[PDB]
Write a protein that binds this ligand. Sequence first.
Ligand SMILES: CC(C)=CCC/C(C)=C/CC/C(C)=C/CO
Length: 284
Amino acid sequence: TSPRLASLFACNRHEKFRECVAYADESYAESLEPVSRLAKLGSCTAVLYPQGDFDRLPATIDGYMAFLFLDDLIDNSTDMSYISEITSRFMSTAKGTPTDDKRFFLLSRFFTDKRWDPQNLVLAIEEAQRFMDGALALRAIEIEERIITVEEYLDIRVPNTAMGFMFRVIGFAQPELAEDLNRVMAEKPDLWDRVESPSGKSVGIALDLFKVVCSYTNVVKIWQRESPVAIDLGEAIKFMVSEFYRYEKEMAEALEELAEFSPGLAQAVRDVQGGTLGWMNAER
Ligand SMILES: CC(C)=CCC/C(C)=C/CC/C(C)=C/CO
């Protein structure tokens, strides 16, 4: 149930992907297993930053494993009090508060990595906060059993897909693009949002499709209630699949304007989106 999605964007692989896999394995064993899928974010960073600087990718691998680990505790949490404690610990860790807690150690290493461009780091922290606020809002909706529209959902969901976060990390993984990333955010935020918004919407749809019991915070179930005519799960999937292709077309059009501002940054965003989708499909 729920089909492969054919991204408009190529899935390209860093030359040193086999180094990425073996690093992901060793580092997971050492710093995370004491508290599986997580190491397979080795192969994944390799297809997110194919024109990245290999020397930046082990740090990125560690950051993403730690992020995936903690988000698993958040998404798998019943009550707001627990989720609030983890999210606030996440953000104080992203902001450099020291910790000797293996739930947070790899996260800390990534966010305190001295090679960050300083304004890229601030961008990354601010977007991580948007991700966390997104997760808190969605949990509260599921607990309240609040019926919201698809449109309300997707606007909340976009930061919580981590697409915008992975786009900010482009500046760390591919440091030749750090300056263009800062520039576009300071000078053309509207154009930037025309790219990132359909990206988060398409990938949020893809994510929700790929986990077909989360009834008020899955866009498939949400559209089931919103729909003007009764639809079953299979018909709701069909439509949201149609929506995924529509948002990707909107994103690609927006990337043509970004590309005249920065061809390099526009290509790196394409590669993040196409590697994300390539990997989700490949983990069939
Ligand atoms: C998590 C997403 C958007 C896709 C699955 C594979 C992936 C890109 C993992 C690493 C990125 C990350 C920061 C995950 C936090 O959700």
